[PDB]
């Protein structure tokens, strides 16, 4: 439900229609009364540009800052302040634990609507210290997550996530984990680890009840595509494609239904065509997907690697037909991947044979050692000079 704010937000951010999307996007904060944080929030959100606020123009004309955003903010705050005062004062005269708790949960929920990140931590802690039902406690954290994602800075969410982790364990409520799982996936798509995002999204689809979600239908369409990124074909074929779970989840996938088919058939040509389309329809729409580069690389590796891994020979003409990509282009993309050598294949253009070495030997395991090894090499030395002085 507050999750709807995010869905809308990806559209003015990406190019797929800038102006029209902005009014709608602006309305959900307009009611909540987001004003203090709003100007700072726009700057962070950008990683494919275009501000969701009126404080900057990037690609097209921005929607204006409504007066309503300011008016609802002042009214909601004044109310919250009056209510809380009687309760805080009453709390002292009466049972300390009960009265303050009820007051604090409400006070926190309004602070989160403004989007005050600091106001959300302070409000939360007092309730925890005092007596409070385990289900009720755990629910509270969901709001703090929603603001970090809203802000869509990687740093801020990492801080929230640490707190969320300590807290979930104490309470022990599984219904509450499901809502938590979605937020966790939403951050994952946002960085370079879709691999992680896939797991979270799949588990949640099978058993969910409609609380803290932006639209079930969009969410199911999205979930299948992410599973592909993480999962190579022997896992992908069983779980998603032929599995029982996908029917139970319900179908709204078709662009993606065809996509999975192309890897299984061993006919790659249609995979590449769909890849290009998937970036335009899903990714842009959604707020979460930065460092798009990762997504592309992995998907393209998946197609190449599965054919090559199975076959130490193919003839060039067959290999070219199956891949459905142009000859110069198939070569150039691979050239990056071969260097890493988890694939590790040669291509002849004189013998018309594409060879796969396919190391599952000492070569494979050793190459990774080297890459990790470079990072460790700089750090250790840097540490040694700083301390000496």
């Amino acid at each position: 439900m507050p999750l709807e704010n995010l869905e809308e937000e990806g559209l003015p951010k990406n190019p797929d229609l800038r102006i029209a999307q902005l009014r709608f996007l602006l309305s959900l904060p307009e009611h909540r009364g987001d004003t203090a944080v709003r100007e700072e929030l726009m700057a962070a959100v950008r990683e494919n540009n275009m501000a969701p606020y009126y404080e900057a123009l990037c690609k097209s004309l921005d929607w204006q800052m409504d007066m309503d955003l300011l008016s609802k903010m002042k009214k909601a705050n004044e109310e919250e302040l009056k209510r809380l005062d009687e309760e805080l004062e009453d709390a002292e005269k009466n049972l300390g634990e009960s009265e303050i708790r009820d007051a604090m949960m409400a006070k926190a929920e309004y602070l989160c609507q403004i989007g005050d990140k600091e106001g959300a931590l302070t409000a939360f802690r007092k309730t925890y210290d005092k007596t409070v039902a385990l289900g009720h406690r755990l629910d509270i954290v969901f709001y703090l997550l929603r603001i970090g994602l809203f802000y869509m800075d990687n740093d801020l969410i990492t801080r929230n996530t640490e707190k969320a982790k300590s807290l979930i364990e104490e309470g022990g409520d599984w219904d509450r984990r499901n809502r938590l799982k979605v937020y966790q996936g939403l951050y994952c798509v946002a960085i370079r680890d879709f691999k992680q995002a896939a797991e979270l999204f799949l588990d949640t689809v099978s058993t969910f009840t409609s609380y803290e979600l932006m639209d079930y239908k969009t969410f199911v369409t999205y979930t299948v595509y992410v599973s592909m990124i993480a999962l190579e074909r022997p896992d992908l074929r069983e779980k998603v494609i032929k599995g029982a779970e996908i029917l139970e989840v319900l179908h709204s996938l078709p662009a993606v239904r065809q996509y999975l088919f192309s890897l299984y058939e061993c006919r790659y040509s249609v995979f590449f065509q769909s890849l290009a389309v998937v970036e335009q329809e899903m990714k842009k729409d959604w707020l979460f997907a930065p460092h798009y580069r990762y997504y592309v690389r992995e998907m393209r590796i998946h197609a190449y690697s599965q054919l090559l891994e199975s076959y130490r020979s193919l003839t060039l003409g067959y290999m070219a037909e199956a891949f459905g990509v142009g000859v110069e282009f198939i070569d150039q993309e691979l050239s990056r991947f071969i260097a890493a050598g988890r694939l590790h294949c040669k291509i002849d253009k004189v013998n018309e044979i594409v060879e796969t070495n396919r190391p599952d030997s000492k070569n494979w395991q050793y190459q990774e050692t080297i890459k990790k090894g470079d990072l460790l090499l700089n750090r250790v030395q840097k540490l040694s000079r700083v301390i000496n002085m």
Binding site: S269, E279, H291, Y292, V296, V325
Partner: peptide
């Protein structure tokens, strides 16, 4: 080239159409 993903959206579409008409 900062990120391959922008260029790649055009590449996959273009490359398939030409390749298909000719060989595949």
């Amino acid at each position: 080239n900062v990120e391959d993903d922008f260029s790649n959206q055009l590449r996959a579409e273009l490359e398939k159409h030409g390749y298909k008409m000719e060989t595949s």
